[PDB]
């Protein structure tokens, strides 16, 4: 089914975007905080126990 326009009607928005080895990588702001946050939650749980 032919649709109107010259371009694909989907518009993407990226954060930290690039290619490492012909492989796309996009990152937000939460990827690198995960380890610290999980460690903090684990330590607090241990302290409550």
């Amino acid at each position: 089914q032919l649709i109107a326009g010259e371009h694909i009607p989907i518009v993407p928005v990226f954060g930290e975007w690039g290619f490492v080895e012909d492989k796309e990588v996009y990152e937000g702001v939460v990827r690198l905080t995960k380890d610290g946050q999980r460690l903090r939650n684990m330590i607090m749980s241990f302290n409550a126990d």
């Binding site: 995960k34 380890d35 999980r38 460690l39 684990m42 749980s45 241990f46």
Partner: protein
């Protein structure tokens, strides 16, 4: 090794105690053999707490065999000295004697050496707790979504 049977262990224990050996002119008496064999079986069964105690490879005689004396003990060569020294210490009070200080020290040393390897084997570290992260450095686990350790 020359010591291969429970009778050999009992003879060694009695010789160390001085009760009956060729160092003296005394010969081992059958009633002194049977009682010490029973004592040795009881002591080995106490040591080997159904696998949770000292491991020696000792073969426990079953009731089907009439003479317990004469069967091979099955101990390794490195356990015979400890076993028969401790047997001499244990059966010394039968004759209202007292084992000498060297015999007592050798018994202690032999028991410690008996348990040394099993202690090294059993000194094992527990696995990771069920509430640890696996870390993002482990790319395989991170992609598989193995974000936490199993536990137990």
């Amino acid at each position: 090794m020359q010591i291969k049977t429970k009778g050999d262990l009992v003879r060694a224990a009695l010789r160390k105690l001085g009760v009956a050996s060729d160092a003296t002119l005394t010969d081992v008496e059958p009633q002194s053999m049977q009682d010490a064999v029973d004592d040795l079986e009881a002591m080995m069964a106490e040591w080997y707490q159904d696998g949770k105690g000292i491991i020696t490879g000792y073969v426990f005689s079953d009731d089907e065999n009439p003479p317990a004396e004469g069967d091979d003990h099955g101990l390794r060569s490195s356990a015979v000295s400890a076993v028969f020294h401790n047997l001499a210490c244990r059966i010394a009070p039968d004759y209202a004697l007292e084992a000498t200080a060297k015999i007592i020290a050798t018994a202690k040393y032999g028991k410690e050496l008996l348990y040394k390897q099993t202690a090294i084997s059993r000194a094992k570290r527990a696995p990771y707790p069920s509430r640890m992260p696996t870390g993002s450095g482990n790319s395989f686990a991170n992609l598989n979504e193995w974000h936490y350790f199993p536990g137990e």
